[PDB]
């Protein structure tokens, strides 16, 4: 097998067609299914895989109680083929309360973070063996993408942050070759706070649309040069902003360089990608909570910060149903690179008190150049009826 280079053009996208749904919470009501959060999708050259961070427990289990916490010693990265739910035959690939995975065209890299909040370790596991590790540099929850990393010519890049995620003080881009850290670039450019990046190959580079937990309801962009390791950063220009919380569409605004300072604090992992001057992006339908999910194109929304001209809206999850994180993944086709996304469908605590557990399902959509209709594909479990 060769290394991936992703050097094909991006596919024509008219919108997204349904690709996969796991129905994990519905299946957990009558079968042994892992409690999870922070899912993502990544593909080898043949098959797509679903990933999630386990809570070291199945859902119909005494250990499923108090699964709200994001960091515990029992969290592991679960890996299955996409559409195989997380049943007891699922491989735990590493110890992790934060992760990123990608296939370089020869093998899987997993970036696996665990240990103390003040003193976490990232393990780099490549082709089934631990090749490298790094300690927390600013001693305040070392954390990574919770979605796929991107590899070009056998160099994989992952965005990692520590501290309160301030710019150069806290965020680094690691360049990794067969699991070995070969280079580390500090975050440069005007993105002030950068977490949970959703990254895609954009040959020759990698582009990441990220979360700002402090200042922006507009999303940071990080552009990563794979050859000379140089970093630039800015914000998604679009006046229709991708973060939650945010202002409503009539009152929201954005900046191409700076955080917009509108409902800037907190965030959700999400994604966007350029289509010339236009942007395709997903977001929650509700501005103030993780309810519903929609995608659309904003015309000139990659270049023009005054633009609010959306077209090609699709409801993925209707506004009455819970969403969660979402991220991009890229799939190599015959002549072009397609863009796909997943939506985490979070169920249970703290927002739903019918149950003691917190878990997710997924729904997955892929870019289409063809035509498509309408629907809503929510989680679909009835928490009134199933194991507490």
């Amino acid at each position, epitope marked *: 097998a060769e290394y991936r280079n992703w050097s094909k053009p991006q596919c024509d996208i008219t919108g997204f067609a349904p690709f996969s749904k796991d129905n994990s919470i519905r299946l957990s009501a009558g079968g042994d299914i892992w409690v999870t959060r922070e899912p993502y999708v990544s593909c080898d050259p043949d098959k797509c895989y679903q990933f999630a961070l386990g809570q070291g427990t199945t859902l119909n289990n005494v250990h499923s109680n108090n699964t*709200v916490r*994001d*960091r515990t010693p029992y969290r592991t990265l679960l890996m299955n083929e996409l559409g195989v739910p997380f049943h007891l035959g699922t491989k735990q690939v590493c110890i992790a309360w934060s992760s990123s995975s990608c296939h370089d065209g020869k093998a899987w890299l997993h970036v696996c973070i665990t240990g*103390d*909040d*003040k003193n976490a370790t990232a393990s780099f596991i490549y082709n089934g063996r631990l090749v490298d590790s790094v300690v927390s540099w600013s001693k*305040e929850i070392l954390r990574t993408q919770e979605s796929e990393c991107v590899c070009i010519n056998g160099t994989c890049t992952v965005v990692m942050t520590d501290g309160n995620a301030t710019g150069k003080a806290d965020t680094k881009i690691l360049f990794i070759e067969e699991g070995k850290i070969v280079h580390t670039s500090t975050l440069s450019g005007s993105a002030q706070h950068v977490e949970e990046c959703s990254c895609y190959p954009r040959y020759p580079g990698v582009r990441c649309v990220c979360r700002d937990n402090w200042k922006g309801s507009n999303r940071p962009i990080v552009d990563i040069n794979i050859k000379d390791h140089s970093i630039v950063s800015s914000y998604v220009c679009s006046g229709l902003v991708g973060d939650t919380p945010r202002k409503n569409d009539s009152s929201s605004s954005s900046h191409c360089l700076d955080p917009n300072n509108e409902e800037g*604090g*907190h965030g959700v*992992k999400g994604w966007a990608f350029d289509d010339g001057n236009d942007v395709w992006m997903g977001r929650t339908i509700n501005e103030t909570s993780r309810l519903g999910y929609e995608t659309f194109k904003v015309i000139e929304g990659w270049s023009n910060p005054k633009s609010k001209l959306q077209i090609n809206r699709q409801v993925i999850v209707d506004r009455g149903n819970r969403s969660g994180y979402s991220g991009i993944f890229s799939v190599e086709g015959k002549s072009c690179i397609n863009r796909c996304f997943y939506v985490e469908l979070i169920r249970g605590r703290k927002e739903e008190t019918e149950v003691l557990w917190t878990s997710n399902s997924i729904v997955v959509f892929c870019g289409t150049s063809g035509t498509y209709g309408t629907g809503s594909w929510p989680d679909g479990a009835d928490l009134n009826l199933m194991p507490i």
Partner: antibody
Amino acid sequence: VQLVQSGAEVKRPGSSVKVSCKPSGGTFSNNVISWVRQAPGQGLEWMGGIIPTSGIANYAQKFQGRVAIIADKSTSTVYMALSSLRSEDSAVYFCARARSDYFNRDLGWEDYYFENWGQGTLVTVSS
Amino acid sequence: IVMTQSPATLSVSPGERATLSCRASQSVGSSLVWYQQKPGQAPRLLIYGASTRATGVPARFSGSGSGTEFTLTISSLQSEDFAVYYCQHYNNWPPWTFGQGTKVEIKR
């Protein structure tokens, strides 16, 4: 759990001040210890807090850089240091224990409200 | 988030119902505590969520509201109850702003 603070202080502008807080019971739990001040005849103001077990602290932007919260299991004490004082910083400083005991990367803090307070520490500042 | 509190002082007779108001600048959901401060002391928690009394708080202290407007009602003020009262939001993300406070003072 009672909370107990260090005695009152009086300082020149541009100097630094140390306030400390101890429990009556065993050495500090996972519940956040936080620092709130009351400016003279005026409203309360949160300025920061620490998870005593994990030692991670966070601060209001108004105090960022010039304040530090430090925890030590051995002296069983949380210490709040404030630097480059001025007339504005003349206030009463309260130690307080939050119901909150964990910070979630994604979701933030649950129950960040104060169940127990120290007796207060006056800090006086004049040229 | 900004917390606005009214009235800035409330006058009430002994053995009479008090009502205090707090308003947020955004939805704080049900995450709104009420504290009582006597002037010689640190604050005491009365209410959390927006309605549950803290341990040992007398049943005459009663809280209600959600989203953006909240109230503390005291059923019949004793000499124990004339104090300053503060709302604070405990929304999931910093900073944790307080209301400027309502003084509750005796009518004669």
